[PDB]
Design brief:
It is classed as ligase. The complex is a heterotrimer. By secondary structure, chain A is mainly beta. Chain A has 1 helix and 6 strands; from the N terminus they run E-E-H-E-E-E-E. In chain A, strands 1, 2, 3, 4, 5 and 6 form a 6-stranded mixed β-sheet that branches. The longest helix of chain A is centred in the first third of the chain and has 12 residues. Chain B is α+β, with helices and mostly antiparallel strands. Chain B has one domain: Potassium Channel Kv1.1, Chain A, CATH 3.30.710.10. The chains are: A mainly beta, B alpha+beta, C alpha+beta. Bound molecules: the ligand CC(=O)N[C@@H](C)C(=S)N1C[C@H](O)C[C@H]1C(=S)NCc1ccc(-c2scnc2C)cc1. Ligand DV8 binds next to strand 2 and strand 4 of chain C.
Chain lengths: ~100, ~90, ~140
């Protein structure tokens, strides 16, 4: 079963998919191809929870019925510059305007 | 699978499969690996990228198709984007 | 042109609404005129008597948005194999993002206020040109 994801760091957002049975480490290999940074310089998060390389996405709560195409699940990303990892930072999207009078 | 970059007016960089982005005829013309959108904010373009994923998944599929959701707050801006992009 | 054939050979059918919309069945009669039938709530089904060679199509009962039936526009009852009813699975199509956006805007704004919205004049005409059964019948011709 496929799960559909947004992998997000700063003002960067990757749309991709994977199997429930695939691992956190295998997802880092997908990021390596796009963003050109090896797995050992990456940290992946479900909200404020660091994810272990060996665990499957299904064990970390990304299931096919919650992580949908029209509404994918978010996975935090954080790189290592030289020695230490940076703090997790996900810039929010822009705010919509107020509903016009006619749509109220 | 080749990926492309779609950049919103406020600077968010969205990275999606080329195949998915080619759903839009307008985007195909802008390419034929990055494309900047001066009029589309990130809260519209994030929904646009989700529609691509939805469209490829459920096109030519017999399994039951669910409703593509759109909040009232984003309908106007999203209508104008879909019209420009032709998708 | 698009009209039911008068076969008089009975055909039992199951209308099954596998969409989130309230469904309006429409039978195209012997002169080609659309006849509306009682509505089906979301996720419900009904066993009905029709005939072979009769044409049917299906719409959203509130907005007349187009729906599919067994993957396609029209449904025609066929010969019942071993006295078993023909299944007519009604579903959503994969709408375009534009048409989906127009559906949501139409459902929030009243027809009179369409021209007050801050958009190009072509989008007023796209909004006002709301889905219609008689337009699509000319389109399938
Ligand atoms: C001689 C002839 O063919 N007459 C026509 C008018 C008949 S009897 N028709 C037209 C269609 O083939 C269907 C059939 C009718 S009117 N069947 C009765 C019927 C009643 C209600 C329903 C529906 S549709 C949604 N809910 C119901 C209860 C379906 C069929």
């Amino acid at each position: 079963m496929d799960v559909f994801l947004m992998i997000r760091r700063h003002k960067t957002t990757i749309f991709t998919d994977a199997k429930e049975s695939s691992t956190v480490f295998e997802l880092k290999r997908i990021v390596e191809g796009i963003l050109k940074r090896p797995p050992d310089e990456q940290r992946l998060y479900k909200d404020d929870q660091l994810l272990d390389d060996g665990k499957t996405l299904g064990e970390c709560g990304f299931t096919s019925q919650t992580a949908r195409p029209q509404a994918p699940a978010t996975v935090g990303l954080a790189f290592r510059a030289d020695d230490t990892f940076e703090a997790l930072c996900i810039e929010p999207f822009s705010s919509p305007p107020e509903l016009p009078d006619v749509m109220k | 699978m080749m990926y492309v970059k779609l950049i919103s007016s406020d600077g968010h960089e969205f990275i999606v499969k080329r195949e998915h982005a080619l759903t839009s005829g307008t985007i195909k013309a802008m390419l034929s690996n990055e494309v900047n959108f001066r009029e589309i904010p990130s809260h519209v373009l994030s929904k646009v990228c989700m529609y691509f994923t939805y469209k490829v998944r459920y096109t030519n599929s017999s399994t039951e198709i669910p409703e593509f959701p759109i909040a009232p707050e984003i309908a106007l801006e999203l209508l104008m984007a879909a019209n420009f992009l032709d998708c | 042109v698009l009209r039911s054939v008068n076969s008089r050979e009975p055909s039992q059918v199951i209308f099954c609404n596998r969409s989130p919309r309230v469904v309006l069945p429409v039978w195209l009669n012997f002169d080609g005129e659309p006849q509306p039938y009682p509505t089906l709530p979301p996720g419900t089904g009904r066993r009905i008597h029709s005939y072979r060679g009769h044409l049917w199509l299906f719409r959203d009962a509130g907005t007349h948005d187009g729906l599919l039936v067994n993957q396609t526009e029209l449904f025609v009852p066929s010969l019942n194999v071993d006295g078993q009813p023909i299944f007519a699975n009604i579903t959503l199509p994969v709408y375009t993002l534009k048409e989906r956006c127009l559906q949501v805007v139409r459902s929030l704004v009243k027809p009179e206020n369409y021209r007050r919205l801050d958009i190009v004049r072509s989008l007023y005409e796209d909004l006002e040109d709301h889905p219609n059964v008689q337009k699509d019948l000319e389109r399938l011709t």
